[PDB]
Design a protein around this ligand. Structure first.
Ligand SMILES: [Cl-]
Ligand SMILES: [Cl-]
Ligand SMILES: [Cl-]
Ligand SMILES: [Cs+]
Ligand SMILES: [Cs+]
Ligand SMILES: [Cs+]
Ligand SMILES: [Cs+]
Ligand SMILES: [Cs+]
Ligand SMILES: [Cs+]
Ligand SMILES: [Cs+]
Ligand SMILES: [Cs+]
Ligand SMILES: [Cs+]
Ligand SMILES: [Cs+]
Ligand SMILES: [Cs+]
Ligand SMILES: [Cs+]
Ligand SMILES: [Cs+]
Ligand SMILES: [Cs+]
Ligand SMILES: [Cs+]
Ligand SMILES: [Cs+]
Length: 129
């Protein structure tokens, strides 16, 4: 599913991401935009052989199981395919874990490089939430 910007903001809010660990909803929408372009089916292989899945590009080295990442952990206790669903619950639940892990949203390198420090509220401007 490819979400619209406001549609995704609303779904993230419905699943408790708005201001989770102090990150306003715009931060999450911005991260999603640059990670997956709001496509829940996004996959991208990493040089290390792990793969990133879903709207927030969650990595199989630590967070989910894909059966092909040697030496990895599955800390969200979910198959990586569950991160590709049109329902974002699994991605959201796993992202809450990730953002709680010590470095905040800097876990997502694209957030650090493209969202951090910017006017993230633009990502939710105009949306009925
Ligand atoms: Cl957009
Ligand atoms: Cl294995
Ligand atoms: Cl933080
Ligand atoms: Cs919240
Ligand atoms: Cs809030
Ligand atoms: Cs790519
Ligand atoms: Cs790649
Ligand atoms: Cs990647
Ligand atoms: Cs990556
Ligand atoms: Cs990525
Ligand atoms: Cs990632
Ligand atoms: Cs495994
Ligand atoms: Cs494993
Ligand atoms: Cs586990
Ligand atoms: Cs789970
Ligand atoms: Cs940690
Ligand atoms: Cs950490
Ligand atoms: Cs990372
Ligand atoms: Cs800035």
């Amino acid at each position: 599913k490819v979400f619209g910007r406001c549609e995704l903001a609303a779904a993230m809010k419905r699943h408790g991401l708005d201001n989770y660990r102090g990150y306003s909803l715009g931060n999450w929408v911005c991260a999603a935009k640059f990670e997956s372009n709001f496509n829940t089916q996004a996959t991208n292989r990493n040089t290390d052989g792990s793969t990133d899945y879903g709207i927030l590009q969650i990595n199989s080295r630590w967070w989910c199981n894909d059966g092909r990442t040697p030496g990895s952990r599955n800390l969200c206790n979910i198959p990586c395919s569950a991160l590709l669903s049109s329902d974002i619950t699994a991605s959201v639940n796993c992202a809450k874990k990730i953002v709680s892990d010590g470095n905040g949203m800097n876990a997502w390198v694209a957030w650090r490089n493209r969202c951090k420090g910017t006017d993230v509220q633009a990502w939710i401007r105009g949306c009925r939430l």
